[PDB]
Amino acid sequence: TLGNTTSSVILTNYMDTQYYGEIGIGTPPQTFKVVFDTGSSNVWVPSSKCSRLYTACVYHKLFDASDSSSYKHNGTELTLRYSTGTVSGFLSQDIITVGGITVTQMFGEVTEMPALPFMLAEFDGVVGMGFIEQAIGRVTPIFDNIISQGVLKEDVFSFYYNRDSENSQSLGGQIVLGGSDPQHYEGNFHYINLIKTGVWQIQMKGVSVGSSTLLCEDGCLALVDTGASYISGSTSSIEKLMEALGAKKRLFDYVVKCNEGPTLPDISFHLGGKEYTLTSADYVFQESYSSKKLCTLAIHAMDIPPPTGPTWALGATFIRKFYTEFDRRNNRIGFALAR
Numbered sequence: 327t328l329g330n331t332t333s334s335v336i337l338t339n340y341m342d343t344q345y346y347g348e349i350g351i352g353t354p355p356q357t358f359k360v361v362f363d364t365g366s367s368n369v370w371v372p373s374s375k376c377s378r379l380y381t382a383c384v385y386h387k388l389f390d391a392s393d394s395s396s397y398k399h400n401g402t403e404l405t406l407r408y409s410t411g412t413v414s415g416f417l418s419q420d421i422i423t424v425g426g427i428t429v430t431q432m433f434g435e436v437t438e439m440p441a442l443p444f445m446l447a448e449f450d451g452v453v454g455m456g457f458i459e460q461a462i463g464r465v466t467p468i469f470d471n472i473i474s475q476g477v478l479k480e481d482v483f484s485f486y487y488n489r490d491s492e493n494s495q496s497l498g499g500q501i502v503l504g505g506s507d508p509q510h511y512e513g514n515f516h517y518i519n520l521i522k523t524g525v526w527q528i529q530m531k532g533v534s535v536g537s538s539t540l541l542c543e544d545g546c547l548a549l550v551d552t553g554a555s556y557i558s559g560s561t562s563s564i565e566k567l568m569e570a571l572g573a574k575k576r577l578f579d580y581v582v583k584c585n586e587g588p589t590l591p592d593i594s595f596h597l598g599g600k601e602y603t604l605t606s607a608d609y610v611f612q613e614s615y616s617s618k619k620l621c622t623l624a625i626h627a628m629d630i631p632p633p634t635g636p637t638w639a640l641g642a643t644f645i646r647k648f649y650t651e652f653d654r655r656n657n658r659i660g661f662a663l664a665r
């Protein structure tokens with residue numbers, strides 16, 4: 327069922343690596359900073375039942391079911407194993423407000439939240455924007471429950487991620503539920519169909535580094551991930567790509583001498599009919615131009631296990647350059663040049 331409602335959620339940009347907005351859980355609402363993530367399908371927030379021996383719980387907002395009149399107990403155990411770390415707890419039901427839309431939602435109350443990496447998180451929890459097929463405990467995702475209300479103009483949602491400005495008047499980003507915002511893209515959308523329903527993953531025809539370098543020569547996969555900070559490829563792919571850029575490997579990332587940063591070649595991703603090109607300014611964290619400092623790149627190695635992987639992941643690095651529309655009705659992803 328389709329309505330005529332478009333709902334927008336304003337996002338805060340934390341250092342070009344974390345994009346989060348607000349949701350309200352319970353009666354009266356308890357507010358949380360959440361990442362709207364296409365690479366996962368579960369909703370979770372830290373719990374008041376989390377041991378204060380987990381320091382990430384001490385430094386985050388905690389859901390207290392005892393203060394909510396609309397809460398409905400469940401208690402089923404839940405473990406969420408991600409590429410960056412694991413969280414676990416149990417299932418709870420309550421009313422969630424997201425951009426003015428109110429929805430009765432089943433979510434995870436996290437009682438085990440590791441300091442590495444969650445002490446580095448500015449956000450409290452996660453709003454999984456993925457499909458039911460990837461939902462742990464087969465819990466209905468929030469977008470499916472919003473679709474069931476039949477209030478949205480279209481069975482789509484869109485992402486705008488801005489570049490990190492020091493100006494407070496700068497919008498960090500914006501998620502539109504039920505449509506797209508023409509004020510944050512130009513030209514037209516070009517769509518690529520999903521390999522299969524259940525994953526925001528598309529076919530990638532090839533990856534180009536300048537002129538003389540080539541990767542994904544025989545085709546590969548690309549996960550379009552709003553929760554991932556960077557563009558990622560497999561260790562092998564990223565080793566060849568980084569050799570071509572003259573970048574040196576560290577523990578969790580790759581770096582270049584800051585002065586070498588603006589000299590780096592363009593990187594192009596062949597998706598559907600079009601070539602999606604990023605210049606050095608789009609993937610180098612140009613914190614200085616000094617020959618005496620090292621500058622990080624917004625491209626990392628990440629080995630995603632099957633059935634989803636081995637795959638590339640197009641995170642915030644990609645979405646900043648290209649406004650993204652996630653189309654559920656047609657199982658496709660649309661890209662347009664952001665503005």
Ligand SMILES: CC(C)[C@]1(C)CC(=O)N(Cc2cccc(N3C[C@@H](c4ccccc4)CC3=O)c2)C(=N)N1
Binds near residue numbers: 361366448452
């Ligand atoms: C968690 C996160 C939002 C999930 C649910 C899990 C996941 O592992 N990914 C992929 C992913 C890949 C590469 C980098 C990151 N993040 C996410 C950001 C982060 C994550 C954890 C703590 C601090 C900062 C900063 C970063 O490095 C995330 C998701 N699709 N979403």
Ligand SMILES: *[C@@H]1O[C@H](CO)[C@@H](O)[C@H](O)[C@H]1NC(C)=O
Binds near residue numbers: 399401417
């Ligand atoms: C938790 O929720 C699921 C939803 O399908 C339900 O089947 C299960 O029985 C619930 N458990 C309790 C103890 O309420």
